[PDB]
Amino acid sequence: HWGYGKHNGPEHWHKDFPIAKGERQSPVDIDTHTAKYDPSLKPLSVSYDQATSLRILNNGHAFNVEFDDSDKAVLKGGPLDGTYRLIQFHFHWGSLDGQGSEHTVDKKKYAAELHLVHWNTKYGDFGKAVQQPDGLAVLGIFLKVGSAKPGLQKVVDVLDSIKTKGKSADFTNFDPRGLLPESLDYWTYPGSLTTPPLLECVTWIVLKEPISVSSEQVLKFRKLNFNGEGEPEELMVDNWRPAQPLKNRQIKASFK
Numbered sequence: 001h002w003g004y005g006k007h008n009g010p011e012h013w014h015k016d017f018p019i020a021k022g023e024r025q026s027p028v029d030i031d032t033h034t035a036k037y038d039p040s041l042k043p044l045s046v047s048y049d050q051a052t053s054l055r056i057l058n059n060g061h062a063f064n065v066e067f068d069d070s071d072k073a074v075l076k077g078g079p080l081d082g083t084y085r086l087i088q089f090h091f092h093w094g095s096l097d098g099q100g101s102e103h104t105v106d107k108k109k110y111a112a113e114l115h116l117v118h119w120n121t122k123y124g125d126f127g128k129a130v131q132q133p134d135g136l137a138v139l140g141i142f143l144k145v146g147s148a149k150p151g152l153q154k155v156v157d158v159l160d161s162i163k164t165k166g167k168s169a170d171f172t173n174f175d176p177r178g179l180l181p182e183s184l185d186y187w188t189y190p191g192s193l194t195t196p197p198l199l200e201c202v203t204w205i206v207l208k209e210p211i212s213v214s215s216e217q218v219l220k221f222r223k224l225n226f227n228g229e230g231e232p233e234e235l236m237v238d239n240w241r242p243a244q245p246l247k248n249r250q251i252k253a254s255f256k
């Protein structure tokens with residue numbers, strides 16, 4: 001079963017998922033001396049007021065918060081056509097503050113990265129959406145260690161109750177607006193799922209401004225287990241895929 005270790009990690013993925021060496025694989029390094037400011041890029045339209053969080057789950061790769069995708073949390077605008085519905089969010093993080101993000105900015109690795117996953121509604125269901133180049137829009141947001149993020153506290157406090165693979169808790173009344181920074185300045189490029197099946201169905205939208213999270217908050221991420229309860233203890237850390245080659249895609253910025 002795929003994972004992040006020496007024996008099942010990103011370097012083994014191409015064997016079951018040959019697309020791993022594709023033309024638009026994610027994440028990528030965002031090189032700012034090559035990123036193209038695009039004045040035509042619209043401001044992002046995040047509408048999360050109606051988001052209906054359901055539960056949080058430890059899937060053995062990370063923990064993910066599922067939403068009711070009817071409920072009308074939607075991402076639109078920015079570089080996107082049509083309506084993308086929020087279906088879930090999750091994080092990738094490191095074994096120390098100095099790494100854990102998937103995207104990098106001039107090779108800088110952040111402590112973590114939040115991904116808010118949305119799907120294009122012309123495709124009827126998530127499953128069909130992922131089979132299309134414009135099937136998904138993932139909003140990526142970096143995490144740096146600093147002051148606490150109040151909107152994160154419910155997430156981290158619940159982690160104690162979902163330590164091992166397959167564990168879930170109820171997670172109603174979670175407002176994902178609280179995971180957002182001040183600015184919605186962004187980079188964007190066509191990419192992929194950063195986990196298997198690595199499908200090239202994603203319009204990546206990566207925010208310029210990281211959110212500040214406390215050391216106390218990020219530490220809780222590192223107490224999760226990859227393994228199931230009663231299995232050999234595998235700590236859930238460094239669950240990130242390294243930056244992939246851009247292969248001459250244009251990363252467009254909405255700010256200079």
Ligand SMILES: COc1cc2c(cc1O)CC[C@@H]1[C@@H]2CC[C@]2(C)[C@@H](OS(N)(=O)=O)CC[C@@H]12
Binds near residue numbers: 057087126127
């Ligand atoms: C393959 O076809 C489909 C899959 C899914 C759906 C509809 C489909 O037609 C609806 C919800 C999708 C779920 C897949 C697992 C998700 C992303 C979950 O991610 S997760 N927990 O990390 O495995 C959260 C929401 C899930």
Ligand SMILES: COc1cc2c(cc1O)CC[C@@H]1[C@@H]2CC[C@]2(C)[C@@H](OS(N)(=O)=O)CC[C@@H]12
Binds near residue numbers: 127196
């Ligand atoms: C094709 O249908 C499915 C897809 C997935 C799952 C189950 C399905 O039935 C479970 C894991 C799902 C993954 C989709 C991309 C996720 C959310 C990834 O999001 S990401 N990193 O932003 O590209 C991380 C976990 C991935």
Ligand SMILES: [Zn+2]
Binds near residue numbers: 060
């Ligand atoms: Zn799995």
Ligand SMILES: [Zn+2]
Binds near residue numbers: 090091092115194
């Ligand atoms: Zn992710």
